[PDB]
Nucleic acid binder design. Sequence first.
RNA 1: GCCUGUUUACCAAAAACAUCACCUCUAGCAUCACCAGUAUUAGAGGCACCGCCUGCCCAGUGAUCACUUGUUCCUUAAAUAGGGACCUGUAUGAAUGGCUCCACGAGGGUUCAGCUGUCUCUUACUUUUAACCAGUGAAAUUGACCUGCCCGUGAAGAGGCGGGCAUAACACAGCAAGACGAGAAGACCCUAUGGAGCUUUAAUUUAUUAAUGCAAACACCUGCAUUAAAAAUUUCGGUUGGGGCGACCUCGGAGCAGAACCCAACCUCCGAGCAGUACAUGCUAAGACUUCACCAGUCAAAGCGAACACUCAAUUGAUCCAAUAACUUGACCAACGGAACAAGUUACCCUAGGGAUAACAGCGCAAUCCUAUUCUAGAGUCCAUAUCAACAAUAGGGUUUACGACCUCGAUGUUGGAUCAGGACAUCCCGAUGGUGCAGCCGCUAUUAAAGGUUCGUUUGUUCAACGAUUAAAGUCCUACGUGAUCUGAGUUCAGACCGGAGUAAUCCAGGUCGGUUUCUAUCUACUUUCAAAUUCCUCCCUGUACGAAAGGACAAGAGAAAUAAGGCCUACUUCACAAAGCGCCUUCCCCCGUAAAUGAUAUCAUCUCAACUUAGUAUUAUACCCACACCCACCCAAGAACAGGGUU
RNA 2: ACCCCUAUACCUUCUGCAUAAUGAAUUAACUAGAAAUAACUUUGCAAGGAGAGCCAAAGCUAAGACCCCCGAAACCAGACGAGCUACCUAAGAACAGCUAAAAGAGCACACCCGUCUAUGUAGCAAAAUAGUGGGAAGAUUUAUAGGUAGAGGCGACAAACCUACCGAGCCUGGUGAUAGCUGGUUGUCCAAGAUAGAAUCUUAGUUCAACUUUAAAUUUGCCCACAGAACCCUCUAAAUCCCCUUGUAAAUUUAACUGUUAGUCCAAAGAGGAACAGCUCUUUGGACACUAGGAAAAAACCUUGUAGAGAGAGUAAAAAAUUUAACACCCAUAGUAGGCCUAAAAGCAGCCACCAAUUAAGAAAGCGUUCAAGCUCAACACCCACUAAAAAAUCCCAAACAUAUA
Lengths: 215, 100
Amino acid sequence: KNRTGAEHLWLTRHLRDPFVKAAKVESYRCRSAFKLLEVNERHQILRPGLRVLDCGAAPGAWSQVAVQKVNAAGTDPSSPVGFVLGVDLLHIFPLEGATFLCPADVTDPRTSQRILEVLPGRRADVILSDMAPNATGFRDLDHDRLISLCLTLLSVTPDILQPGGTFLCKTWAGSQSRRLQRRLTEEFQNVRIIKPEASRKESSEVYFLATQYHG
Amino acid sequence: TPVKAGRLVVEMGGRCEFEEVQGFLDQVAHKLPFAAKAVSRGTLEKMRKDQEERERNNQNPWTFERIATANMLGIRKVLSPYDLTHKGKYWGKFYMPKRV
RNA sequence: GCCUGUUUACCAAAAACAUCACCUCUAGCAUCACCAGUAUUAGAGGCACCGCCUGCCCAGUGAUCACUUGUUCCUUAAAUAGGGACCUGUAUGAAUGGCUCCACGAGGGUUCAGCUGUCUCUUACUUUUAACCAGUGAAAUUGACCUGCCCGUGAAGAGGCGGGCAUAACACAGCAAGACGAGAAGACCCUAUGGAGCUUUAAUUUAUUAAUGCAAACACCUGCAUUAAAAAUUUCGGUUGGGGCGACCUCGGAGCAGAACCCAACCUCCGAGCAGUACAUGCUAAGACUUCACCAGUCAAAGCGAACACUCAAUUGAUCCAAUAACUUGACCAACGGAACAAGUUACCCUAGGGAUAACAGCGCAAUCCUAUUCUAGAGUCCAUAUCAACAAUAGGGUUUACGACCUCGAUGUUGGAUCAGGACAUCCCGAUGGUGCAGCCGCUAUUAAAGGUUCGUUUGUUCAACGAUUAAAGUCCUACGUGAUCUGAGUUCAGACCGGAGUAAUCCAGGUCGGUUUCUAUCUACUUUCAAAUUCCUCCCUGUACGAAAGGACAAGAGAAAUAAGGCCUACUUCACAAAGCGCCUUCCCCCGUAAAUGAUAUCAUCUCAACUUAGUAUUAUACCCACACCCACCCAAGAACAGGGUU
RNA sequence: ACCCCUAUACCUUCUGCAUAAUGAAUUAACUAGAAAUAACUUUGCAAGGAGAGCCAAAGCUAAGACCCCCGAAACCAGACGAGCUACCUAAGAACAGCUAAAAGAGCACACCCGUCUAUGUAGCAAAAUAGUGGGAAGAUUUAUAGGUAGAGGCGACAAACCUACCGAGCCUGGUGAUAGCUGGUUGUCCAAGAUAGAAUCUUAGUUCAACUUUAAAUUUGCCCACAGAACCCUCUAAAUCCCCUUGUAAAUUUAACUGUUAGUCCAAAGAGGAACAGCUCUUUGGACACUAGGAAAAAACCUUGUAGAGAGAGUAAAAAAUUUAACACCCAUAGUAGGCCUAAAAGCAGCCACCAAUUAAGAAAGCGUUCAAGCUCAACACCCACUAAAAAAUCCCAAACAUAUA
Ligand SMILES: [Mg+2]
Ligand SMILES: [Mg+2]
Ligand SMILES: [Mg+2]
Ligand SMILES: [Mg+2]
Ligand SMILES: [Mg+2]
Ligand SMILES: [Mg+2]
Ligand SMILES: [Mg+2]
Ligand SMILES: [Mg+2]
Ligand SMILES: [Mg+2]
Ligand SMILES: [Mg+2]
Ligand SMILES: [Mg+2]
Ligand SMILES: [Mg+2]
Ligand SMILES: [Mg+2]
Ligand SMILES: [Mg+2]
Ligand SMILES: [Mg+2]
Ligand SMILES: [Mg+2]
Ligand SMILES: [Mg+2]
Ligand SMILES: [Mg+2]
Ligand SMILES: [Mg+2]
Ligand SMILES: [Mg+2]
Ligand SMILES: [Mg+2]
Ligand SMILES: [Mg+2]
Ligand SMILES: [Mg+2]
Ligand SMILES: [Mg+2]
Ligand SMILES: [Mg+2]
Ligand SMILES: [Mg+2]
Ligand SMILES: [Mg+2]
Ligand SMILES: [Mg+2]
Ligand SMILES: [Mg+2]
Ligand SMILES: [Mg+2]
Ligand SMILES: [Mg+2]
Ligand SMILES: [Mg+2]
Ligand SMILES: [Mg+2]
Ligand SMILES: [Mg+2]
Ligand SMILES: [Mg+2]
Ligand SMILES: [Mg+2]
Ligand SMILES: [Mg+2]
Ligand SMILES: [Mg+2]
Ligand SMILES: [Mg+2]
Ligand SMILES: [Mg+2]
Ligand SMILES: [Mg+2]
Ligand SMILES: [Mg+2]
Ligand SMILES: [Mg+2]
Ligand SMILES: [Mg+2]
Ligand SMILES: [Mg+2]
Ligand SMILES: [Mg+2]
Ligand SMILES: [Mg+2]
Ligand SMILES: [Mg+2]
Ligand SMILES: [Mg+2]
Ligand SMILES: [Mg+2]
Ligand SMILES: [Mg+2]
Ligand SMILES: [Mg+2]
Ligand SMILES: [Mg+2]
Ligand SMILES: [Mg+2]
């Protein structure tokens, strides 16, 4: 055993968490799926027939939500069939109605080319980003790293994202966040900062949602 | 499946001696839940004869059977009715071969 | 949550309430409220500024108008289906829902930069308190106490019981491990034919009010009846973790007392709540049986009268009361010994109790798990035993178990952290060995070893989980979460509030989120400088050696640097200044025992020997410190709470 | 005096247990069983008794002799309360300074409030202090007088406030409310005295039975021996019922009452979905709630019961045992690599036969080689001897001892 204070605090929080209980009930792989659900309840980012790119897809709960919403699985005959693509360096468990390209990193041009090839029409309607660098124990360093990753995603965005497209990305709060927001404001008409109730109150995590892409 | 003391669990025959089969049979006997041993016709008969001989040979004036049947110290108070038949050889599932 | 504002006086200031604006409902009116008012008004409510979207059950097609249809009548036995009239003076729909947004907030969360003893890691000084002297002088508490420790016993748990051990007696000052430490106030579960508040589609009412009708009276009043509103009185059976969905409560049969009777709770199964044939299924009467009481229930000789007291395991219901001329009849009173008729909810709760309370409540071994051994199948290139290991067995330590072969989720002084740790070894590191599928460095495995040590941070996802950076290693456990009269998160867990779900509601959730009061002056036990023996890492030498084909790369012995720990100190530095401190400086000493070998018998070889024996082997370590005693005026002190101690040549 | 030996405070409660829990600082005083019918006992009179009524098939009259204490939350009636607080009415008062086109504006006094922390917790205080805070021309704060009253008021709903304790104030009365619940229940001595059940809005209680006590009447009671008490299911035991004799002395009936009961543990047999342990439960018996001795302390195991005094004696039960693993020396040619399948299996991948030479060796029992090659074993001589486990947490736990006559 030999649990520390922080270890025990996290563990109690995890056990008492309703979202993990809900995930195990609703056969969701991870709790963070619920965050996307909430976002989709507010802005209706996902519609049937839409093309979805998912980055840092593992363990694939985001892909699960995506395929359910965009009717990628084709459960609803009336609803148009959509496309969901998931990219993560770690191996992802197979899911019906979804394709996973692994191992790949979005930043790499070669991997980007592969994604485009697999994607119908060589473009993606919506991009979802949930990846985060391994927490180093320092808020500043982790913040900078995640901002850098989001900036690289934003740089590679134009090639993959259709005009008027939607982009959701997870960021830790800090100094550089403002700068990123400005850059989003430069490229997207609508920029929103969303903290879902599924996201831990103690956590500094937040979501930048960018809508109506131009240029 | 229940097994009582004195029960033959498995049998074996053929063109072989006891010593040949005894090895693996004893192996199996050890791996059984209850106390068990490999026996031939000869060995079983010898065992029974030795028990009979011990009963006849005993120098102890007092036997469990005698005392139990006659209720000699009011002993039936601490004995089971089954003890009359068991003659003190059997105690629960366990069996004592060393008791006359 | 628009805002300013209001709220639980005395644990909640809020997201709750109110609030402009908007919306719904009700009302055509005077001399005591509304109001000396009148529909742009007034009252009862909902929602919460503004701003932007969201609006038809108005009868259908065809070319305001014809025509079936809708509604009403009549003909028709009555209908079907025919004859006539009307729908053409107007209609709007939401106390509906979403959406941004300016300002604001002791609201909840996140964050930039600085900042600071919050922390690394604490120190110095002042005041209060303190301790001593003088005066005054409480409280909770108290069976009596001449009030020890270890192990055991007492389902846990002992100052007092057993076996050991210890022990001149008395203050004063600290301490909080024990005295299930003290005072209330709790929280949890259960109980009472104990309360109360609230709700209703619980039962019983309509005395009250309002309206209506019928009498009376010639509109009001009175009597009667009906309808509503408003209340009023009273209750909320029993079993089943607890809760939801269910099941059950009476009678008969089997497991089921092996053989007189009785007796197996709970459970596992079955069945019964009739029916058929008589119509003397008439009357009466010895003696008996009996569901362990009573009430009920059962059998029956003889006799009178007839003829030549039915089958079936249960197949059932007291009293009262009602109907009836009598004879009789009447409850799915099934909660089946039966109240004539009464439900929910309480986190606003109350009282009287019981139980946990708190470390037992389930203590001499069935089921299951882990560990070790045994078994020798099977992996391991061949090769059980370098390493791993199937079905099993044995030993030790955990967990579970009496019936809804239903989905749950439980528990809750429950568990984190701080402080200080005591202990075990089943060793994570450091020591010493044996084996290896051990060339060396790393390893794998076992034996021995508890002296010492065993880090700092942070959570994007992870069902007792990680991530980052380290380390010689970041051990597994017991100690009533070890430790709350040393401190502190969260949970049980609640008084306020909202969301999702449930419920007609009150309210609930075994769901989520915000806010939220436990005080203690120490009487006793125990203890308050045991001390004098330190570990580890890294670097260098060996040496780049041995080893190895290279790649790579030791062990002993020695040297140097550190870190920590224990014990001191102030020359400098730093906090500061006759001094106290760390961030500074100084010192730090013995081994461990598992095996590896000689000689050599039982057993003339061999054999390390629970043979006599011989070495590694170290054995009892040892040494260090302390050690003379005026006056006990006074003064001083590097000594000190008091006391004591040192100095006064 | 102490030292020695022996000795687990008292009361009360829980089905049973105390050592658990309850109550007690101590002293003095005060503080808790009230009555009938019917029975019994003792008198009077007696088919009558009684000082009208009433009873009477020996009764009647009289007397004696049996029935506690404290405690709720509540409910209702009649008063008293708005000098606190909630709201309102009448007529008043207060609000520095600075910024502001000027305000339920901002900063900020006084004033009002009470966010957060610390102190305090029998306190300065039955809600305070210090700092920090929110508001501070207004839906503001505040003085005076008046009003609304409990089946109610009042409320920017907090079940808020209504004189420190409001889910319904306070006081008095009804009221000695009621309490199947908790606690208590006061001289001495002796005697008899314990666990089948049924019903119940019932399992914290009560009524009947069972057991227990007393008094009275009368004859059997208990222990028991032959004989006797079922088939079916294919099995089933210890036993039980009935019972002369005998050994014993009790039993039944009558009259009158109370009180007790989910008892606990041990031995045995079982029951709870075909759960060997545990839990729950039934039966038989024992012990315990009654003494003592013993087993380490010890309710339930063993020994033992009928009471006192003794500085006598004989006894009963009554002290655990156990220590465990050696083993052969010597030697081995050959028909042939026995045939089939197999790259080949040649003694040992598999199948069939299992003969045969020396004096004596299995067409080979175990290893080992891709197959071979090899190391054993059985074989001949030689004559040798060969007879089964352990661990834990404060500190091991009587001291010890193999050798004088049960
Ligand atoms: Mg966190
Ligand atoms: Mg507000
Ligand atoms: Mg204001
Ligand atoms: Mg405000
Ligand atoms: Mg207030
Ligand atoms: Mg308050
Ligand atoms: Mg407050
Ligand atoms: Mg509101
Ligand atoms: Mg606020
Ligand atoms: Mg003091
Ligand atoms: Mg004094
Ligand atoms: Mg006092
Ligand atoms: Mg003890
Ligand atoms: Mg003792
Ligand atoms: Mg003291
Ligand atoms: Mg005590
Ligand atoms: Mg009642
Ligand atoms: Mg009542
Ligand atoms: Mg009877
Ligand atoms: Mg019965
Ligand atoms: Mg007859
Ligand atoms: Mg009933
Ligand atoms: Mg009944
Ligand atoms: Mg009955
Ligand atoms: Mg509440
Ligand atoms: Mg108790
Ligand atoms: Mg208790
Ligand atoms: Mg193998
Ligand atoms: Mg438990
Ligand atoms: Mg320690
Ligand atoms: Mg060890
Ligand atoms: Mg623990
Ligand atoms: Mg404590
Ligand atoms: Mg607060
Ligand atoms: Mg001196
Ligand atoms: Mg007391
Ligand atoms: Mg007044
Ligand atoms: Mg007033
Ligand atoms: Mg006025
Ligand atoms: Mg002013
Ligand atoms: Mg203002
Ligand atoms: Mg202001
Ligand atoms: Mg107000
Ligand atoms: Mg409310
Ligand atoms: Mg409330
Ligand atoms: Mg009051
Ligand atoms: Mg009373
Ligand atoms: Mg007696
Ligand atoms: Mg009843
Ligand atoms: Mg009851
Ligand atoms: Mg009761
Ligand atoms: Mg007889
Ligand atoms: Mg019992
Ligand atoms: Mg040989």
